[PDB]
Amino acid sequence: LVKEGASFNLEDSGNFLCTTVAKGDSDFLKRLLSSGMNPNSEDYDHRTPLHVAASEGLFLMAKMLVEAGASVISKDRWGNSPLDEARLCGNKKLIKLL
Amino acid sequence: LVKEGASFNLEDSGNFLCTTVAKGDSDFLKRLLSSGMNPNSEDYDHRTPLHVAASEGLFLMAKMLVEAGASVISKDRWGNSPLDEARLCGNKKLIKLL
Numbered sequence: 001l002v003k004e005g006a007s008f009n010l011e012d013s014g015n016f017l018c019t020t021v022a023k024g025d026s027d028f029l030k031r032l033l034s035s036g037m038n039p040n041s042e043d044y045d046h047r048t049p050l051h052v053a054a055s056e057g058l059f060l061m062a063k064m065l066v067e068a069g070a071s072v073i074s075k076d077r078w079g080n081s082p083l084d085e086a087r088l089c090g091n092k093k094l095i096k097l098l
Numbered sequence: 099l100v101k102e103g104a105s106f107n108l109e110d111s112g113n114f115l116c117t118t119v120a121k122g123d124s125d126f127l128k129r130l131l132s133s134g135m136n137p138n139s140e141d142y143d144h145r146t147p148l149h150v151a152a153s154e155g156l157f158l159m160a161k162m163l164v165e166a167g168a169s170v171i172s173k174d175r176w177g178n179s180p181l182d183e184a185r186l187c188g189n190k191k192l193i194k195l196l
Contacts, residue, residue: 015117022142023113044120045153052143055175077153078176078186 013041152183
């Protein structure tokens with residue numbers, strides 16, 4: 001389906017991507033990556049998925065999100081950078097990856 | 099379906115609350131909450147639907163949530179209370195309702 005060229009059509013890119021991040025389905029997320037969806041979508045607002053990634057605790061998918069188009073200084077509607085959540089969680093591996 | 103007594107009984111209710119608030123469907127969300135679906139539950143990101151309502155600033159559906167049993171005490175993942183979010187919004191009526 002990616003060889004012919006016909007593309008996907010998200011119902012809500014930001015909402016779906018942040019819901020997938022919150023659910024923490026590694027297989028589903030990597031299959032979405034295999035589909036080639038842009039991880040720049042964050043939420044209906046600008047709530048960065050890296051915030052949820054730091055909240056959960058794991059680091060590999062946070063690195064995957066931030067390394068594909070995502071920005072480390074994204075400002076949500078509140079105005080909070082992912083550095084804020086990274087410091088709040090206290091986990092250092094995600095800090096190094098960011 | 100209501101007189102049959104059927105509850106929502108879905109794990110995706112939290113996932114759908116945030117999407118409904120984000121979409122802004124007033125009548126649809128009001129009918130959903132008037133049904134067995136319970137607005138008190140948190141979202142995928144442990145987000146209070148009342149907190150997101152305060153962030154958006156829609157007074158009518160926020161009133162519907164607080165009438166249907168949404169708790170101001172329950173907080174978002176960030177730790178901000180829905181009352182704190184209403185204060186951040188700047189709507190005095192929303193603040194007093196919160």
